[PDB]
Amino acid sequence: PKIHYRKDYKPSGFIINQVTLNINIHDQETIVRSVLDMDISKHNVGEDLVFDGVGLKINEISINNKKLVEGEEYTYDNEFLTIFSKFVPKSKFAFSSEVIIHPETNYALTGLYKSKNIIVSQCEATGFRRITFFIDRPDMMAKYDVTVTADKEKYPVLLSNGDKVNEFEIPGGRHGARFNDPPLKPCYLFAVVAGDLKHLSATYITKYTKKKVELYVFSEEKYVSKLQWALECLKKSMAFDEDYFGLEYDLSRLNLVAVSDFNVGAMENKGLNIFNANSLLASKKNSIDFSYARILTVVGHEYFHQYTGNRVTLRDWFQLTLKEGLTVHRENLFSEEMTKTVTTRLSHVDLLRSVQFLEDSSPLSHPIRPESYVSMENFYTTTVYDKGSEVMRMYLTILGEEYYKKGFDIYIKKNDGNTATCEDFNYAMEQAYKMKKADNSANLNQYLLWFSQSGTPHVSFKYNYDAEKKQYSIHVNQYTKPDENQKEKKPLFIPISVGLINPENGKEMISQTTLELTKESDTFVFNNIAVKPIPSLFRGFSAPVYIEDQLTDEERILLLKYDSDAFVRYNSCTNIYMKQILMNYNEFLKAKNEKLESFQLTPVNAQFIDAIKYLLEDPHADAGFKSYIVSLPQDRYIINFVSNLDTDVLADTKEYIYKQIGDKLNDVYYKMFKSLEAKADDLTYFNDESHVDFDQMNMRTLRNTLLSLLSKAQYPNILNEIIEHSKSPYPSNWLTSLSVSAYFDKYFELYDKTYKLSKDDELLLQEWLKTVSRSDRKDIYEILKKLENEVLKDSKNPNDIRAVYLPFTNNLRRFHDISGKGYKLIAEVITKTDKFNPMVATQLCEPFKLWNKLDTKRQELMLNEMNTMLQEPQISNNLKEYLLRLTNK
Ligand SMILES: N=C(N)NCCCC[C@H](N)P(=O)(O)O
Ligand SMILES: [Mg+2]
Ligand SMILES: [Zn+2]
Numbered sequence: 107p108k109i110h111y112r113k114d115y116k117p118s119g120f121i122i123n124q125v126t127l128n129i130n131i132h133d134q135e136t137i138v139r140s141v142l143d144m145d146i147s148k149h150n151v152g153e154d155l156v157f158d159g160v161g162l163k164i165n166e167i168s169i170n171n172k173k174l175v176e177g178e179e180y181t182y183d184n185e186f187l188t189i190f191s192k193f194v195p196k197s198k199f200a201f202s203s204e205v206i207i208h209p210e211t212n213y214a215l216t217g218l219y220k221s222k223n224i225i226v227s228q229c230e231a232t233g234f235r236r237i238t239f240f241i242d243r244p245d246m247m248a249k250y251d252v253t254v255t256a257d258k259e260k261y262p263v264l265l266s267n268g269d270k271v272n273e274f275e276i277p278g279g280r281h282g283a284r285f286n287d288p289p290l291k292p293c294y295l296f297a298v299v300a301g302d303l304k305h306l307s308a309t310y311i312t313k314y315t316k317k318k319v320e321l322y323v324f325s326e327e328k329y330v331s332k333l334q335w336a337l338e339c340l341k342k343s344m345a346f347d348e349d350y351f352g353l354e355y356d357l358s359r360l361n362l363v364a365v366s367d368f369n370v371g372a373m374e375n376k377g378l379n380i381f382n383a384n385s386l387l388a389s390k391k392n393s394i395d396f397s398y399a400r401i402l403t404v405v406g407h408e409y410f411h412q413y414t415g416n417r418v419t420l421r422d423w424f425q426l427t428l429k430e431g432l433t434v435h436r437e438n439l440f441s442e443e444m445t446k447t448v449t450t451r452l453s454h455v456d457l458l459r460s461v462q463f464l465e466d467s468s469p470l471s472h473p474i475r476p477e478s479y480v481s482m483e484n485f486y487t488t489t490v491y492d493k494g495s496e497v498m499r500m501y502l503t504i505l506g507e508e509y510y511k512k513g514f515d516i517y518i519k520k521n522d523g524n525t526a527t528c529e530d531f532n533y534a535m536e537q538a539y540k541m542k543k544a545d546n547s548a549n550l551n552q553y554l555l556w557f558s559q560s561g562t563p564h565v566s567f568k569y570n571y572d573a574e575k576k577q578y579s580i581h582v583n584q585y586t587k588p589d590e591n592q593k594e595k596k597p598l599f600i601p602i603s604v605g606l607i608n609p610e611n612g613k614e615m616i617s618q619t620t621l622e623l624t625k626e627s628d629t630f631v632f633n634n635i636a637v638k639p640i641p642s643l644f645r646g647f648s649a650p651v652y653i654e655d656q657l658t659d660e661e662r663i664l665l666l667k668y669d670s671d672a673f674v675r676y677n678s679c680t681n682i683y684m685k686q687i688l689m690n691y692n693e694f695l696k697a698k699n700e701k702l703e704s705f706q707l708t709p710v711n712a713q714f715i716d717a718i719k720y721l722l723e724d725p726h727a728d729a730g731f732k733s734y735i736v737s738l739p740q741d742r743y744i745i746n747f748v749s750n751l752d753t754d755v756l757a758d759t760k761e762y763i764y765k766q767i768g769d770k771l772n773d774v775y776y777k778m779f780k781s782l783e784a785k786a787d788d789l790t791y792f793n794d795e796s797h798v799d800f801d802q803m804n805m806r807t808l809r810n811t812l813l814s815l816l817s818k819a820q821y822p823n824i825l826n827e828i829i830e831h832s833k834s835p836y837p838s839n840w841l842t843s844l845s846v847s848a849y850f851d852k853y854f855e856l857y858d859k860t861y862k863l864s865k866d867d868e869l870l871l872q873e874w875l876k877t878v879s880r881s882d883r884k885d886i887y888e889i890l891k892k893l894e895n896e897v898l899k900d901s902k903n904p905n906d907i908r909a910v911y912l913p914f915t916n917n918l919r920r921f922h923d924i925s926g927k928g929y930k931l932i933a934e935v936i937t938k939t940d941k942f943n944p945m946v947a948t949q950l951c952e953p954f955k956l957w958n959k960l961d962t963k964r965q966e967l968m969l970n971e972m973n974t975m976l977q978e979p980q981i982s983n984n985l986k987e988y989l990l991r992l993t994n995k
Contacts, residue, residue: 107987111478112424118241119150122248125293127238129218131225131256131300135206136218137165140238142201142248155189155201158235158242161217165204167239169195187239203239212236213902213942216483221367224301224326225261226380230373231423231482234293244420245525247290254298255282261300263324265361267291267376287376290523295416297375299363304330306337310344312354319344319355325364325387329868332387334795335398336362339405346406346440351514353413362386362405366868367903369945372404374411381408384869384905390792392867395803395838399450403441410436413518421525423482427474427557428528430486431494435502438495445800448672449730449807455647455673456734458496460742462488463652466562467746468955469994471589475528475557480987483945496650497556501535503601503620503648505542513538528557552599552624560591563598565623566654571638578606578635583627584651597626603648605670606632606639609661612668615639620648640664645671652746655681663717672731679735680743682714683763687744691759698755710766718767719774729782730804733811736775738763741918745959752961753922760918768819776821779812787834803838810842817846818882825850832856837863837870841877848882871897872909880913886920887927904946911935915953922960926967929954933971936985937978944982951988969993 124143129136164182167174169189174180180189212219217236218227227237235242252266258281268287275281303324310319321340323333340362347353357377368382385404388397414436415429442450465471465488472487474494479485502510517526517534536550568581582602586595602621605614615637621630640661644653655662655678662678669675689708697705718735721727738744738760745751768775786805791797813831816824829852832843840860847856857878864874875893883889890910898910911932915921921928932950940947957968975981976989 107480107983109478109480110423112422112476115422115424117147117149118243118246119147119153120155120241121145121147122241122246124249125240125251127250127252129237129252129254129298131209131254131261133257134208134210136209136225137204137206138238139204140202142240143198144201145198146196152191154191155194156241157187157189157201157239158185158232159187159205159239160185160232160236162205162207162236162239165206167201167203169193169201170199171202201239205238207237214945215367215369215904215943216945218298219367221365222326223260224299224303224365225256226299226301226363226365227297227375228369228373228380229296229375230294231485232294234296240293242293243422244292244294245422247292247419247525249290250287250296251284252287252296252298253282253284254300255280256300260302263299263301263303265297265299265324265363265378267295267297267378269358291376291416292419295374295376297373297378297380299324299378299380302327303363306330306333308337308341310341310355312344313348314352314354317354317358319357320359322359322361323364323386324361325383326366329364329383329387332389332392333364335388335798336364336386336401336405338796338798339402340409342402342444343406343409343440346443347410347413347436350439350443351413351511351518353518355412356417360409362408366905369904370949372408374408374415376412376416379408381405382905384872387869389795391835391837392870393837394841394873395806395836397869398798398803399441399445399800402444403437406440406444407433407437410440417523418518418521419525421527423479423485424475424477425527426485427490427494427497428526428531430491431474431496432498432531434491434495435498438499447730447800447804448728449734449804451646452672452676452731452734454492454495455676456740456743458488458492458650459746460740462492462650463562463746464742464956465489466493466560467587467959469590469958469992470955471560471591473558473560473591477591481984483984484948484988493650496647500556500601500649503603503646504599504622505535505538509538509542512541529554532557550599552597555596555598559586559595559598561586561589561595562650562652563600564652564654565600565602565644565649567641567643567656569641569656571635573638576634576636578632578639580604580621580630580632580641581627582621582623582630584623585626597624599624600649600651602643603645605642605645605674606635607642607665607669608637609640609664610637612664614670640669642669642671642674644677645674647673647677653677653681657681659685659711659714663711663713666717666735667720676731676734680739682711683739684744684747686710686763687738687756687759688747690762691748691755694755694758694762695752698752707762710763715767715770719771722771722774722778728804729801729808733804733808736767736771736811736815741916742956745956749959750961750965751959753918753964754924757918764815764818768815772816772819772821775812775815779809779816779827782809787836787839789835792835806836806838810838813842814846817849820849825852828852828856832859837873841873844874844877845881853881853883869905872905875906875909876913879910880916882917886914886917887931890914890931902942904943904949907935907939907946908949911950912952921953922964924963924967926964926970929968929971933975937975940978940982940985941980944984947982947985948988951985951992954989954992957992 122142122144126141128139179193209218209220209225216228216233234240254264264283266285268285271286272284304327305322305324307322323337361378363380364383364386366383372381410433414432513535532550540546540548563584563586566583570579600623604619606616608615659682662682665678666675693707786809828843828847832840834840844856844860847853864870893910936947936950972989972993
């Protein structure tokens with residue numbers, strides 16, 4: 107098991123200047139001929155020429171048009187092709203090869219593969235060596251000239267990077283196209299697509315040079331009518347980069363291609379972005395509302411990579427967060443601007459504090475720039491992407507918008523066309539920082555610890571108000587727990603966006619203020635503060651930390667009602683729920699441990715319930731925000747706060763608190779579910795493919811959240827509402843009608859009805875599977891066996907597999923059944939999946955991420971299954987590294 111370390115980076119002793127490819131696709135095989143025009147670099151020391159090449163069948167290899175001889179001049183072990191140096195030329199030379207590969211049986215979805223009737227490549231991070239021999243690393247920049255040939259009836263549309271420069275017929279019903287891409291790129295940005303594709307297209311005229319860019323969006327014929335929203339998202343993302351960053355697309359064409367078999371999200375191959383179909387295709391009739399924000403986010407993300415990844419490039423894979431965290435940050439600024447809803451930012455924070463904080467306190471914890479890896483395909487994580495994004499967003503918080511834009515433009519100007527490292531970005535932000543402070547000794551050297559230090563910092567607070575002096579003090583402390591990567595943790599540069607709210611009238615008492623905490627502790631004093639304020643802390647969630655606000659529930663309720671910042675309101679509500687959860691959890695645990703015949707539970711704070719009602723009833727408050735306040739914090743957020751968590755006790759805890767609140771508010775919930783109908787379900791623009799109303803979708807979210815509350819509660823006659831909801835034209839509503847019907851005898855009648863509505867659209871069927879898998883059913887195990895037998899079968903489609911199993915794994919009572927049957931079930935699936943797609947097998951491991959956080963019993967049950975999987979003689983290297991790291995072994 108070979109380990110790559112970041113401090114071992116050294117430039118290659120070779121150069122590849124030019125690639126010329128001929129890819130000939132036949133029914134039973136694909137033949138790839140390649141010529142690499144190569145040189146010896148200044149770093150060369152007479153070493154063997156070693157190419158990456160995985161799973162390739164050699165017909166022949168040459169240097170300078172002379173065939174090499176296996177054994178005497180080269181060895182190939184199905185991973186590395188070693189050409190002994192005595193046979194490697196000392197000046198410029200040509201390497202050439204012809205290999206056979208088999209996209210039809212390439213179910214790992216890496217390299218060249220077949221998805222249904224489309225041939226498509228995926229090369230990031232190490233897929234190009236599955237297509238042909240190469241020094242497959244991102245600093246090897248080259249020019250590419252690519253020819254593809256195929257049966258014309260089966261593959262009429264042929265695509266690769268660059269300009270299509272020739273199209274030609276070939277006898278026996280075949281054809282070819284040649285594509286030349288002169289600008290240098292790394293091999294992971296190469297792509298090819300062949301298929302009977304249909305398209306929509308538009309022309310975009312750039313803002314400054316007025317260049318015409320042609321936009322093409324492609325899918326299989328059946329779904330071409332679901333491409334319109336994606337095309338609209340593409341125009342939006344080009345405008346945003348133009349308007350916010352001043353940046354224009356450089357190429358004459360940009361193609362977006364949807365495929366059915368894909369490994370999560372999309373891929374930014376230069377001018378040829380390829381997407382999971384679930385992140386490109388939607389229609390109002392056949393998609394849930396979530397698809398619309400998802401397409402916007404993923405199209406935008408792949409577009410923004412054109413600068414941050416494709417024009418400014420990575421020196422090595424350890425810099426991954428420099429393109430990924432920075433592109434997610436760019437993505438999030440665009441989505442916030444396009445949706446105009448506060449729930450966009452809150453949804454990002456909700457994701458980070460549940461999934462990413464869990465990772466960062468697990469044995470898998472790593473900093474956003476790791477020090478080593480075995481498998482690159484395990485490095486594409488929520489920490490690298492989403493914590494990376496919060497690190498990139500903190501520069502904007504520290505600088506503000508004008509100087510942030512200056513620093514960013516410095517980074518692009520200086521590094522356009524070249525590789526870069528995380529230091530280069532920090533350097534650019536520092537120059538902006540020096541200008542902003544007006545002080546050329548000011549620096550961001552301490553900022554660099556955000557790249558190297560793992561774990562989530564904890565930030566805690568104490569306060570002092572002197573009423574005679576009108577003087578208010580905020581005492582702040584930071585700490586990060588030691589973990590496997592650092593013995594001692596150092597204090598970070600933590601920007602704390604704050605306001606001070608007057609508790610008498612709800613008004614702001616100070617101007618915008620961002621505290622820079624740069625030491626282990628500091629005291630921040632404010633004068634002329636006329637009354638004791640309530641502090642509004644980490645506005646916008648201004649650093650990726652555990653916030654310990656040390657406020658009373660009285661103060662938190664006042665913030666929730668009156669504060670101006672949506673995140674502080676939401677966080678105050680979160681902190682009230684957490685104090686409640688921890689209290690009832692310990693009360694239930696003590697009763698279970700002591701086998702009590704009777705015990706008491708602390709009720710939910712009545713003024714908090716009142717504050718929720720006050721907000722729900724406010725006709726001017728936001729529907730998306732309302733849905734957050736009636737929902738308890740996610741299970742994976744809660745688990746960050748409890749040791750040895752017993753999942754049954756936590757389920758009983760959530761049940762009690764939901765019933766306490768429902769016993770007071772269910773009439774208000776019912777009333778709102780009814781009065782919301784008109785605007786939420788308005789069909790005015792149902793047949794307008796480009797009209798997307800985020801506010802209206804948030805209204806539907808709230809209706810569907812309230813309907814779920816009322817159904818769990820068995821509110822009188824709610825089944826009438828459920829049944830009517832099932833007749834809605836919106837899939838978000840009728841799939842909701844399936845989930846909430848779980849509590850009634852009508853479940854299976856709705857299962858059949860919604861199956862029939864979903865079964866003829868591949869992506870809608872996947873959404874139906876997720877609904878079933880997530881259903882709160884006592885017979886959920888029998889229902890999974892039914893999905894396997896009747897719907898899933900032996901599908902190797904990652905979307906189908908993920909849809910059937912992942913939502914089930916979040917079922918707190920049932921996945922964590924104390925017999926361990928749930929863990930056994932998922933382990934069996936992981937091991938089956940690993941035989942053909944180790945990436946998806948690793949994704950299906952996700953519930954095991956918290957194994958060492960649960961009660962003794964469950965910890966032992968999960969560890970048993972992990973060890974069973976590790977003992978499988980046919981385990982992939984990718985699955986093995988992951989589980990070895992997760993189990994500390
Ligand atoms: N887990 C992997 N090895 N594959 C991910 C490679 C592609 C990620 C794309 N760059 P995205 O960040 O979705 O644009
Ligand atoms: Mg092979
Ligand atoms: Zn990306």
